[PDB]
Enzyme design. Structure first.
Site, PDB file in Angstrom:
ATOM      1  N   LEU A 192       0.778  -1.235   0.000  1.00 31.96           N
ATOM      2  CA  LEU A 192       0.000   0.000   0.000  1.00 31.96           C
ATOM      3  C   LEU A 192       0.814   1.292   0.000  1.00 31.96           C
ATOM      4  O   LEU A 192       0.453   2.264  -0.656  1.00 31.96           O
ATOM      5  CB  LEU A 192      -0.988  -0.001   1.164  1.00 31.96           C
ATOM      6  N   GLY A 193       1.898   1.302   0.765  1.00 35.13           N
ATOM      7  CA  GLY A 193       2.640   2.519   1.036  1.00 35.13           C
ATOM      8  C   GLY A 193       3.607   2.335   2.189  1.00 35.13           C
ATOM      9  O   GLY A 193       3.884   1.212   2.587  1.00 35.13           O
ATOM     10  N   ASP A 212       2.156  13.016  15.322  1.00 37.72           N
ATOM     11  CA  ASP A 212       2.563  12.930  13.929  1.00 37.72           C
ATOM     12  C   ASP A 212       1.466  13.347  12.964  1.00 37.72           C
ATOM     13  O   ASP A 212       1.475  12.942  11.810  1.00 37.72           O
ATOM     14  CB  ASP A 212       3.075  11.534  13.589  1.00 37.72           C
ATOM     15  N   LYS A 224       1.582  -4.261   8.347  1.00 41.15           N
ATOM     16  CA  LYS A 224       2.827  -3.524   8.299  1.00 41.15           C
ATOM     17  C   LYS A 224       3.956  -4.450   8.686  1.00 41.15           C
ATOM     18  O   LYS A 224       3.928  -5.062   9.741  1.00 41.15           O
ATOM     19  CB  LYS A 224       2.769  -2.346   9.262  1.00 41.15           C
ATOM     20  N   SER A 256       5.167   3.917   9.419  1.00 41.87           N
ATOM     21  CA  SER A 256       6.213   4.620  10.136  1.00 41.87           C
ATOM     22  C   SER A 256       7.444   3.750  10.348  1.00 41.87           C
ATOM     23  O   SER A 256       8.564   4.219  10.180  1.00 41.87           O
ATOM     24  CB  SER A 256       5.691   5.117  11.486  1.00 41.87           C
ATOM     25  N   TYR A 257       7.255   2.491  10.713  1.00 38.37           N
ATOM     26  CA  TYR A 257       8.405   1.612  10.912  1.00 38.37           C
ATOM     27  C   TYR A 257       8.659   0.611   9.785  1.00 38.37           C
ATOM     28  O   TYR A 257       9.700  -0.034   9.751  1.00 38.37           O
ATOM     29  CB  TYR A 257       8.291   0.887  12.252  1.00 38.37           C
TER      30      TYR A 257
HETATM   31  C1  LIG Z   1      -3.412   0.932   8.533  1.00 44.72           C
HETATM   32  N1  LIG Z   1      -2.790   1.868   7.572  1.00 44.72           N
HETATM   33  C2  LIG Z   1      -1.812   2.655   8.024  1.00 44.72           C
HETATM   34  O1  LIG Z   1      -1.519   2.507   9.200  1.00 44.72           O
HETATM   35  C3  LIG Z   1      -1.142   3.557   7.317  1.00 44.72           C
HETATM   36  S1  LIG Z   1      -0.364   4.781   8.007  1.00 44.72           S
HETATM   37  C4  LIG Z   1       0.204   5.450   6.648  1.00 44.72           C
HETATM   38  C5  LIG Z   1      -0.225   4.699   5.635  1.00 44.72           C
HETATM   39  C6  LIG Z   1      -0.964   3.643   6.001  1.00 44.72           C
HETATM   40  N2  LIG Z   1      -1.466   2.823   5.074  1.00 44.72           N
HETATM   41  C7  LIG Z   1      -0.664   2.483   3.889  1.00 44.72           C
HETATM   42  C8  LIG Z   1      -2.679   2.309   5.173  1.00 44.72           C
HETATM   43  N3  LIG Z   1      -3.327   2.259   4.004  1.00 44.72           N
HETATM   44  C9  LIG Z   1      -4.571   1.777   3.950  1.00 44.72           C
HETATM   45  N4  LIG Z   1      -5.264   1.697   2.824  1.00 44.72           N
HETATM   46  C10 LIG Z   1      -4.804   2.163   1.670  1.00 44.72           C
HETATM   47  C11 LIG Z   1      -5.656   2.095   0.584  1.00 44.72           C
HETATM   48  C12 LIG Z   1      -5.258   2.551  -0.657  1.00 44.72           C
HETATM   49  C13 LIG Z   1      -3.998   3.084  -0.830  1.00 44.72           C
HETATM   50  S2  LIG Z   1      -3.544   3.653  -2.412  1.00 44.72           S
HETATM   51  N5  LIG Z   1      -3.533   5.283  -2.425  1.00 44.72           N
HETATM   52  O2  LIG Z   1      -2.151   3.132  -2.772  1.00 44.72           O
HETATM   53  O3  LIG Z   1      -4.560   3.140  -3.434  1.00 44.72           O
HETATM   54  C14 LIG Z   1      -3.136   3.155   0.258  1.00 44.72           C
HETATM   55  C15 LIG Z   1      -3.536   2.692   1.509  1.00 44.72           C
HETATM   56  N6  LIG Z   1      -5.184   1.345   5.050  1.00 44.72           N
HETATM   57  C16 LIG Z   1      -4.556   1.383   6.282  1.00 44.72           C
HETATM   58  C17 LIG Z   1      -3.276   1.878   6.333  1.00 44.72           C
END
Ligand SMILES: CN1C(=O)c2sccc2N(C)c2nc(Nc3ccc(S(N)(=O)=O)cc3)ncc21
Ligand SMILES: CN1C(=O)c2sccc2N(C)c2nc(Nc3ccc(S(N)(=O)=O)cc3)ncc21
Ligand SMILES: [Cl-]
EC number: 2.7.11.1
Lengths: 289, 285
Positions: A15-16, A128, A38, A19-20
């Protein structure tokens, strides 16, 4: 049962960045539920992570991301958390390549404030708060996320001396080392509002280390173009961006504020969210080719 | 379910005993009703080391090695869910009965224990804390290696570890000396364990551990408190385990071929001993 993590979870594309660790889309096979996991290296300091996990467990709110479980695969820690379809506010801004209009900002901020209000009631400081850490439901409801650097307060009059967070969004008091309340988050929210409106935080161009020194000394940040923004929005930001913490408004107070009060329902977000996804898929489909 | 609270997921009962880094409690899985043993570990404790222990458990897939089911966080504590053995540790069994083991019982337990070691060594991991306390018996009477808290992994089968760790009485001489040691170090512990089962305590047990640790490298290999009681086969087996030089010490696989191990009776013989302990345990409650 003796079931491996792969057996429990089917893991999709990342997804992305958490933090860690990087965060991955995943499915829970028994329920078919979608979750975000994560992956944290063993090398990373665990004690801090355990503290982060505990805070999430303590929390039980619609505006705060839930923590489900953790697993060990190889020698890494996988933390299982609630999944938000839309993604971060920051992501939505990036995919569309368009900054939010005031109506969108107000609706999102209102949900965030309700979340902050809950954390603050619980005597916790996120520390944060930024667009990246605000997450959206496909439904478009907003949740606080990534309590990597979050802190706990014993009492109403308790304070934390630790200086931590993302520098652009950090409160001046935190930098000053006086010690500070939950209210520090409120300043961060103000930087975030600017971030949604202009797409980047003030001082983004300058190096973070140089910036951190400047913030306490400098006057409160202002919109790059004042002319564009409405009176209610300008005031709301003005209230958030107050150098001295005693002066600064609480989350509870802000909800009362006109910009927040007149904020439209989550439904108005839906077209924006849909666009962000379709843009995401096309990049995905293009990626397949 | 997926989001269920830790209290919800597991019903925790009496504390079974003590394991490294924490204490172990009997627990019942609510969904399946399966019985597990859960060890509660303090956050302040060195998690990086603990993660290392857990991974080793995951890597193993043996009847002779204790099984790791997973972990969860409650409060600041980390809880490790592990396979539950009804009989308990050999030490528990010796203690509850108050009787030391006969030769027939010892050989059978060692064979399973040796089998567990052979697998562990094959994976190139040294348990590093082999003692009666760490050998666990299920109701059936099968024996499994239990504690991986100090367990170590060899990067290469050739490679050796210089770390000095373990429980001092059972410690191998090579380990105590800072010269490098490998898997064979466990065998020495295995030898000490065998004596412990026969005499109900290890050699030097009544002595101070710091005092003992210094002695062990210098000193001649340990011998039964009364040699007359023990058989020739058992006596030879212990001697093969307790060889001061690692090089001349036997491999676990070699030990399995050894007569004391080879002649071992089936686990069925263990049945009377296990029953008495369990019966005793209920009464104390
Ligand atoms: C649980 N969570 C996080 O703790 C955190 S904190 C910073 C980022 C995240 N991320 C990655 C998340 N992305 C998501 N859902 C989600 C859905 C779609 C996309 S995208 N823009 O690549 O289509 C990114 C994350 N859902 C939850 C998270
Ligand atoms: C998983 N596990 C261990 O890792 C270790 S290692 C050293 C000890 C343990 N412990 C405590 C255990 N006790 C048990 N089961 C068990 C059952 C009965 C008894 S008893 N003798 O009090 O009736 C003890 C342990 N089952 C498993 C363990
Ligand atoms: Cl409302």
């Amino acid at each position: 049962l003796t079931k491996q993590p792969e057996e429990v979870f089917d893991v999709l594309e990342k997804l992305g960045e958490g933090s860690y660790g990087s965060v991955f889309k995943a499915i829970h096979k028994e329920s078919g539920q979608v979750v975000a996991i994560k992956q944290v290296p063993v090398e990373s300091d665990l004690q801090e992570i355990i503290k982060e996990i505990s805070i999430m467990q303590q929390c039980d709110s619609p505006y705060v991301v839930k923590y489900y479980g953790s697993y060990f695969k190889n020698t890494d820690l996988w933390i299982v958390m609630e999944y938000c379809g839309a993604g971060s506010v920051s992501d939505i801004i990036r995919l569309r390549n368009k900054t939010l209009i005031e109506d969108e900002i107000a609706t999102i901020l209102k949900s965030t404030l309700k979340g902050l209000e809950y954390l603050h009631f619980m005597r916790k400081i996120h520390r944060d708060i930024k667009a990246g850490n605000i997450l959206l439901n496909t439904e478009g409801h907003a949740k606080l996320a990534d309590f990597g650097v979050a802190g706990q307060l014993t009492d109403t009059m308790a304070k934390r001396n630790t200086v931590i967070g993302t520098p652009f969004w950090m409160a001046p008091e935190v930098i000053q080392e006086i010690g500070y309340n939950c209210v520090a988050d409120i300043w961060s929210l103000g930087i975030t509002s600017i971030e949604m409106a202009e797409g980047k935080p003030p001082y983004a161009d300058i190096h973070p280390m140089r910036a951190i020194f400047m913030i306490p000394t400098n006057p409160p940040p202002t919109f790059r173009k004042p002319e564009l923004w409405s009176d209610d929005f300008t005031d709301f930001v003005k209230k958030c961006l107050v150098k001295n913490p005693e002066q600064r408004a609480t989350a509870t107070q802000l909800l009362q504020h006109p910009f927040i009060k007149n904020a439209k329902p989550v439904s108005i977000l839906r077209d924006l969210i849909t666009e962000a996804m379709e843009i995401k898929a096309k990049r995905h489909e293009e990626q397949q080719r």
